[PDB]
Short mmCIF file of C-alpha atoms and ligand atoms in Angstrom, two decimals:
data_model
loop_
_atom_site.label_atom_id
_atom_site.label_comp_id
_atom_site.label_asym_id
_atom_site.label_seq_id
_atom_site.Cartn_x
_atom_site.Cartn_y
_atom_site.Cartn_z
CA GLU A 14 116.62 142.47 105.00
CA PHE A 15 114.17 145.54 103.77
CA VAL A 16 112.92 144.86 100.54
CA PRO A 17 112.01 148.41 99.35
CA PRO A 18 108.49 149.68 97.92
CA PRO A 19 108.18 150.38 94.78
CA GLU A 20 108.66 153.83 94.13
CA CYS A 21 105.11 156.41 94.58
CA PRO A 22 104.04 158.61 91.99
CA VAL A 23 106.05 161.60 91.31
CA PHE A 24 105.02 165.17 89.52
CA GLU A 25 107.10 167.80 88.21
CA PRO A 26 103.96 170.27 87.33
CA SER A 27 104.83 173.18 84.94
CA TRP A 28 103.89 176.90 85.66
CA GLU A 29 100.75 176.46 83.97
CA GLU A 30 99.72 173.47 85.98
CA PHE A 31 101.23 175.03 89.18
CA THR A 32 98.71 177.74 89.36
CA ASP A 33 96.00 175.88 91.34
CA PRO A 34 96.93 173.33 93.56
CA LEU A 35 93.39 172.01 93.93
CA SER A 36 93.18 171.33 90.10
CA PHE A 37 96.49 169.96 89.98
CA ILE A 38 95.50 167.32 92.48
CA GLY A 39 91.99 166.75 90.83
CA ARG A 40 93.58 165.99 87.53
CA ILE A 41 96.26 163.58 88.69
CA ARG A 42 93.76 161.49 91.18
CA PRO A 43 93.69 159.19 88.76
CA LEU A 44 96.94 157.82 88.87
CA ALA A 45 97.65 159.20 92.73
CA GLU A 46 94.70 157.60 94.33
CA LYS A 47 95.99 154.19 93.03
CA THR A 48 99.01 154.31 95.42
CA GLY A 49 97.25 156.21 98.27
CA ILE A 50 100.09 159.20 98.02
CA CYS A 51 102.28 160.83 95.58
CA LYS A 52 104.82 163.51 95.70
CA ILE A 53 105.19 167.11 94.07
CA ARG A 54 108.31 168.76 92.66
CA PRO A 55 107.19 172.55 92.05
CA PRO A 56 108.76 174.38 89.23
CA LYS A 57 112.76 174.67 89.99
CA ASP A 58 112.27 178.72 90.47
CA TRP A 59 109.95 178.00 92.89
CA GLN A 60 111.76 178.60 96.33
CA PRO A 61 110.31 179.87 99.42
CA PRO A 62 112.23 181.63 101.90
CA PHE A 63 111.92 179.86 105.59
CA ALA A 64 110.00 182.39 107.87
CA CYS A 65 109.97 180.76 111.43
CA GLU A 66 111.18 183.01 114.20
CA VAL A 67 114.45 180.90 114.14
CA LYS A 68 115.92 183.36 117.53
CA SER A 69 113.17 182.01 119.17
CA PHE A 70 112.29 178.27 118.25
CA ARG A 71 112.16 176.07 121.11
CA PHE A 72 110.71 173.35 121.75
CA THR A 73 110.94 169.64 123.68
CA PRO A 74 110.90 166.83 121.33
CA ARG A 75 108.86 163.10 122.53
CA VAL A 76 111.07 160.49 122.93
CA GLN A 77 110.94 157.95 120.49
CA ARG A 78 112.28 153.93 121.76
CA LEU A 79 111.96 152.22 117.94
CA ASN A 80 111.76 148.79 119.08
CA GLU A 81 108.94 149.34 122.14
CA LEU A 82 106.14 147.09 120.55
CA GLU A 83 108.45 144.14 119.81
CA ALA A 84 110.01 144.65 123.57
CA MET A 85 106.55 143.93 124.76
CA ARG A 89 109.50 140.28 132.64
CA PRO A 90 109.52 143.92 133.23
CA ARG A 91 112.34 146.51 132.90
CA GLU A 92 113.86 147.30 136.23
CA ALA A 93 112.06 151.25 136.48
CA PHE A 94 110.33 151.46 133.09
CA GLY A 95 108.99 154.55 132.16
CA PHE A 96 112.59 156.63 133.08
CA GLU A 97 114.24 155.72 130.08
CA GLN A 98 115.25 159.23 128.96
CA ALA A 99 115.85 162.37 130.75
CA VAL A 100 114.61 165.20 129.29
CA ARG A 101 115.94 167.97 127.18
CA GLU A 102 114.61 171.08 125.40
CA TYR A 103 116.47 172.24 122.60
CA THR A 104 116.10 175.31 119.87
CA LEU A 105 116.56 174.55 116.45
CA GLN A 106 119.78 174.73 116.51
CA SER A 107 121.20 172.89 119.47
CA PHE A 108 118.31 170.14 118.23
CA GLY A 109 120.15 169.60 114.47
CA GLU A 110 123.86 169.83 116.21
CA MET A 111 122.10 166.92 118.68
CA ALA A 112 120.46 165.24 115.10
CA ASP A 113 123.56 165.56 113.31
CA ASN A 114 125.71 164.04 115.84
CA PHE A 115 123.33 161.31 116.53
CA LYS A 116 123.80 160.20 112.64
CA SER A 117 127.56 160.73 111.79
CA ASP A 118 128.16 158.62 115.34
CA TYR A 119 125.88 155.47 114.25
CA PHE A 120 126.76 154.89 111.00
CA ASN A 121 130.22 156.60 111.22
CA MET A 122 130.24 158.33 108.38
CA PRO A 123 129.21 162.24 107.18
CA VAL A 124 125.38 162.64 107.30
CA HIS A 125 124.98 163.39 104.34
CA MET A 126 126.95 159.94 102.91
CA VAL A 127 124.57 157.56 104.39
CA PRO A 128 122.77 155.75 101.63
CA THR A 129 118.80 156.65 101.90
CA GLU A 130 118.59 152.55 101.34
CA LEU A 131 120.80 152.17 104.30
CA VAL A 132 119.00 154.50 107.05
CA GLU A 133 115.79 152.23 105.69
CA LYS A 134 117.11 148.93 106.04
CA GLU A 135 118.18 149.26 109.61
CA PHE A 136 115.82 151.52 110.85
CA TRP A 137 113.54 148.85 110.27
CA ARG A 138 116.04 146.41 111.63
CA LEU A 139 116.06 148.24 114.80
CA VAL A 140 111.95 148.82 115.07
CA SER A 141 112.18 144.41 115.07
CA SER A 142 115.59 144.43 117.78
CA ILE A 143 115.28 142.97 120.50
CA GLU A 144 119.14 143.14 121.07
CA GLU A 145 119.62 146.49 120.59
CA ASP A 146 118.05 149.76 122.19
CA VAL A 147 117.80 152.86 119.65
CA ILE A 148 116.16 155.92 120.84
CA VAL A 149 115.69 159.17 119.09
CA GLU A 150 113.87 162.41 119.34
CA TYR A 151 111.41 164.21 117.40
CA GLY A 152 110.20 167.71 117.33
CA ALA A 153 106.39 166.77 116.22
CA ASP A 154 103.62 168.40 116.65
CA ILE A 155 104.62 171.70 116.90
CA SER A 156 101.91 174.26 115.82
CA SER A 157 102.69 176.76 113.48
CA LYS A 158 101.19 179.70 115.87
CA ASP A 159 103.58 179.14 118.34
CA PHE A 160 106.53 180.23 116.30
CA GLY A 161 104.85 180.91 113.25
CA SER A 162 104.26 179.21 109.91
CA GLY A 163 107.39 178.21 107.67
CA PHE A 164 105.40 179.55 104.79
CA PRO A 165 105.97 183.84 105.01
CA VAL A 166 102.38 184.71 106.00
CA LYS A 167 100.65 188.29 105.63
CA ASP A 168 99.50 188.51 109.58
CA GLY A 169 101.83 191.34 110.20
CA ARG A 170 103.81 189.68 112.66
CA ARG A 171 106.51 189.25 110.51
CA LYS A 172 108.61 191.22 107.61
CA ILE A 173 107.66 189.82 104.22
CA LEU A 174 110.48 191.45 101.28
CA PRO A 175 109.17 192.20 97.65
CA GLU A 176 110.41 189.53 96.32
CA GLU A 177 108.95 186.96 98.99
CA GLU A 178 104.61 188.14 99.17
CA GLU A 179 104.11 185.71 96.05
CA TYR A 180 105.06 183.03 98.77
CA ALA A 181 103.14 184.76 100.94
CA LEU A 182 99.47 184.66 98.56
CA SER A 183 100.33 181.16 96.50
CA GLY A 184 98.01 178.53 97.11
CA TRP A 185 100.91 175.99 98.02
CA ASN A 186 101.26 177.89 101.03
CA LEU A 187 99.98 175.60 103.18
CA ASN A 188 98.30 177.97 104.97
CA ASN A 189 96.54 179.47 102.10
CA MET A 190 95.08 175.65 101.41
CA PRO A 191 90.91 174.82 102.49
CA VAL A 192 90.02 173.47 105.39
CA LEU A 193 86.79 173.88 106.30
CA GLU A 194 84.29 171.12 105.40
CA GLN A 195 81.28 171.05 104.66
CA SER A 196 78.71 170.33 106.92
CA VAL A 197 74.64 171.53 108.21
CA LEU A 198 76.77 172.38 111.77
CA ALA A 199 78.85 174.16 110.01
CA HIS A 200 76.42 176.58 108.99
CA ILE A 201 74.14 175.86 112.73
CA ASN A 202 77.71 176.27 114.90
CA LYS A 209 92.91 174.82 111.51
CA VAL A 210 96.29 175.65 110.81
CA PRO A 211 99.48 173.99 109.62
CA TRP A 212 101.90 172.02 112.83
CA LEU A 213 105.52 171.89 111.77
CA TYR A 214 107.95 168.87 112.28
CA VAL A 215 111.35 169.18 113.38
CA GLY A 216 113.24 165.83 112.47
CA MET A 217 116.04 163.74 112.93
CA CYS A 218 117.99 160.30 111.86
CA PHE A 219 115.44 157.29 112.75
CA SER A 220 112.06 160.01 114.26
CA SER A 221 108.70 158.42 112.91
CA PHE A 222 105.41 158.32 112.70
CA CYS A 223 103.27 154.91 112.89
CA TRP A 224 100.65 153.58 110.44
CA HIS A 225 97.60 155.90 110.31
CA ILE A 226 94.94 157.59 108.54
CA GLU A 227 93.33 160.99 109.05
CA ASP A 228 90.56 162.31 110.91
CA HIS A 229 87.36 162.68 108.86
CA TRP A 230 89.18 160.52 105.98
CA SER A 231 91.02 163.85 105.15
CA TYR A 232 93.44 164.37 102.40
CA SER A 233 96.67 166.00 103.90
CA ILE A 234 99.46 168.15 102.16
CA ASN A 235 102.79 167.70 103.44
CA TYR A 236 106.46 170.25 102.89
CA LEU A 237 109.46 169.33 103.32
CA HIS A 238 111.03 172.79 103.75
CA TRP A 239 114.62 172.34 104.11
CA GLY A 240 117.28 169.38 105.67
CA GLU A 241 117.93 165.80 104.96
CA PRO A 242 114.80 163.07 103.11
CA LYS A 243 111.69 162.58 104.77
CA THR A 244 111.01 158.39 103.56
CA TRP A 245 106.98 157.68 103.21
CA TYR A 246 104.86 154.53 102.46
CA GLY A 247 101.76 154.92 101.03
CA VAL A 248 98.42 152.41 100.72
CA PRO A 249 96.20 152.92 98.42
CA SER A 250 92.02 153.68 99.90
CA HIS A 251 91.42 150.57 97.91
CA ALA A 252 93.36 148.59 100.44
CA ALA A 253 92.71 150.60 103.73
CA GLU A 254 90.32 147.31 104.67
CA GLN A 255 93.06 144.96 103.71
CA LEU A 256 95.95 146.74 105.84
CA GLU A 257 93.53 146.99 109.01
CA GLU A 258 93.20 143.38 109.09
CA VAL A 259 96.65 142.49 108.83
CA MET A 260 96.87 144.62 111.57
CA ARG A 261 93.71 143.18 113.60
CA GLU A 262 95.55 139.59 112.83
CA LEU A 263 99.62 140.64 113.47
CA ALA A 264 99.19 143.34 116.05
CA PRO A 265 99.46 143.32 119.51
CA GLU A 266 96.39 140.96 121.32
CA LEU A 267 96.77 143.56 124.24
CA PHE A 268 96.29 146.31 121.94
CA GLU A 269 93.80 144.88 119.65
CA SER A 270 90.20 146.23 121.16
CA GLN A 271 91.56 149.58 121.17
CA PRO A 272 89.74 151.91 118.95
CA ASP A 273 91.56 152.79 115.35
CA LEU A 274 92.11 157.02 117.20
CA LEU A 275 94.51 155.44 119.77
CA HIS A 276 95.57 152.37 117.96
CA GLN A 277 97.00 154.84 115.52
CA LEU A 278 99.78 155.73 118.31
CA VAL A 279 101.49 152.92 117.90
CA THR A 280 100.58 150.83 114.29
CA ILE A 281 103.97 150.49 113.86
CA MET A 282 104.48 147.59 111.04
CA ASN A 283 107.04 146.70 108.32
CA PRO A 284 105.96 147.16 105.01
CA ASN A 285 106.75 143.89 103.66
CA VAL A 286 104.60 142.14 106.01
CA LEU A 287 101.58 143.95 104.24
CA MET A 288 102.98 143.43 100.84
CA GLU A 289 103.70 139.96 102.33
CA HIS A 290 99.63 139.94 103.32
CA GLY A 291 99.26 140.87 99.36
CA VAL A 292 98.69 145.25 100.43
CA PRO A 293 99.80 147.55 97.99
CA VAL A 294 102.54 150.02 99.50
CA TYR A 295 104.12 152.61 98.24
CA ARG A 296 107.55 154.54 98.88
CA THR A 297 108.93 157.89 98.04
CA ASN A 298 112.12 160.21 99.70
CA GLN A 299 110.30 163.57 100.16
CA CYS A 300 113.36 166.13 99.63
CA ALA A 301 113.99 168.95 100.58
CA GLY A 302 111.46 171.73 98.59
CA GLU A 303 109.32 168.97 97.51
CA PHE A 304 105.39 168.65 98.53
CA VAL A 305 103.64 164.78 99.51
CA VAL A 306 99.79 164.24 99.26
CA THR A 307 98.33 161.78 100.62
CA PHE A 308 94.43 160.90 99.60
CA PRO A 309 91.93 160.24 101.34
CA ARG A 310 91.92 156.94 103.73
CA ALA A 311 95.13 156.40 102.30
CA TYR A 312 97.46 154.96 105.33
CA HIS A 313 100.63 156.02 105.60
CA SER A 314 104.02 155.71 107.71
CA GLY A 315 107.40 156.46 107.70
CA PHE A 316 110.08 158.39 108.43
CA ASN A 317 113.13 160.64 108.64
CA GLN A 318 116.55 160.20 107.33
CA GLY A 319 118.40 163.20 109.32
CA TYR A 320 117.66 167.01 110.00
CA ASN A 321 114.90 168.87 108.64
CA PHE A 322 111.97 170.23 108.93
CA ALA A 323 108.57 169.48 107.77
CA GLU A 324 105.13 171.46 107.56
CA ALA A 325 101.63 169.39 107.48
CA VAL A 326 97.95 170.09 107.19
CA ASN A 327 94.70 168.41 106.17
CA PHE A 328 92.93 170.17 103.42
CA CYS A 329 89.29 169.64 101.91
CA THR A 330 88.50 169.59 98.57
O1 6E7 B 1 105.87 163.08 111.22
C1 6E7 B 1 105.18 163.26 110.06
O2 6E7 B 1 106.28 163.33 109.28
C2 6E7 B 1 104.16 162.92 109.54
C3 6E7 B 1 103.92 162.58 108.25
C4 6E7 B 1 102.78 162.72 107.49
N1 6E7 B 1 101.49 162.67 109.03
C5 6E7 B 1 101.64 162.76 110.63
C6 6E7 B 1 100.21 162.96 111.33
C7 6E7 B 1 100.49 163.06 112.27
C8 6E7 B 1 99.01 162.82 113.38
C9 6E7 B 1 99.51 163.22 114.55
O3 6E7 B 1 98.89 164.22 115.78
N2 6E7 B 1 100.23 162.93 115.57
C10 6E7 B 1 100.59 162.55 116.94
C11 6E7 B 1 101.63 163.02 117.10
C12 6E7 B 1 103.07 162.29 116.38
C13 6E7 B 1 103.48 161.60 116.94
C14 6E7 B 1 104.79 160.84 115.90
C15 6E7 B 1 105.13 160.69 115.51
C16 6E7 B 1 104.50 162.50 114.13
C17 6E7 B 1 103.37 163.05 115.34
C18 6E7 B 1 98.59 163.19 112.48
C19 6E7 B 1 98.07 163.06 111.16
N3 6E7 B 1 99.58 162.92 110.79
C20 6E7 B 1 103.22 162.71 110.38
MN1 MN B 2 99.23 161.59 108.64
#
């Protein structure tokens, strides 16, 4: 069965250390850049409100067939497996919890994170069992607002919430403008509504950017990360073992389907670290750190690429 990778570093900054995000990330870099990803737990009293327009939040999530790569005799009428379904935040959550409790035959919060992890990777490689889930991925914060409070006058902010609108850890306040000559001659966060087994495959960011990720609420998001010094190693294992039909594809397209069991990478000598990102915790990915992961259950994440 699946062997969990070693845990990535988790930091619990003091209030003093928590004042400036870029200063903090710069200070932890000697360790975190060697693990690709790290987790940051804010002080216990730092609790931003959830500021999305919940009443109107509607979306059509993308369908994810866990074993689509292993599955590569064409099945009758491929391309039409799943009927389309639009959800509200509430109705997606009802669907997500029902899916998970039915799947495991127990209440959603009683399913061990290790079991969802072992079962996810079993399902990804299984040809006997076709599990299909849905992911409310890549929803712009412009559509219904950020999960963080923002002083743009579109939504009421209470006095005790203003510090969160102004915080450097509010993802809308991270720096995003890359320096360049073109910048002198001539981005917002994205939202992710997850359910059990919804997932993201191995990738790095455009321009080898840092990214930062905040789980507003819900069940954990499980991460795997590879340090940048091993990026070429991972890419070589992909070349060797990924489907030949996709071998010649540019990285930007190949990354849409680069699913790989972390143990395969580990057996080929690639260092992999894991973490369960819980509600109220940040994950930071360092430049050219490959990462992938899946959601343990119904949850809500916000993410943005930032520059140093
Ligand atoms: O899902 C997450 O929590 C997550 C975590 C870390 N990074 C990403 C991420 C996604 C994209 C992206 O646009 N993907 C295409 C759309 C997409 C397809 C399946 C799953 C999630 C997105 C680019 C860069 N990073 C997503
Ligand atoms: Mn990413």
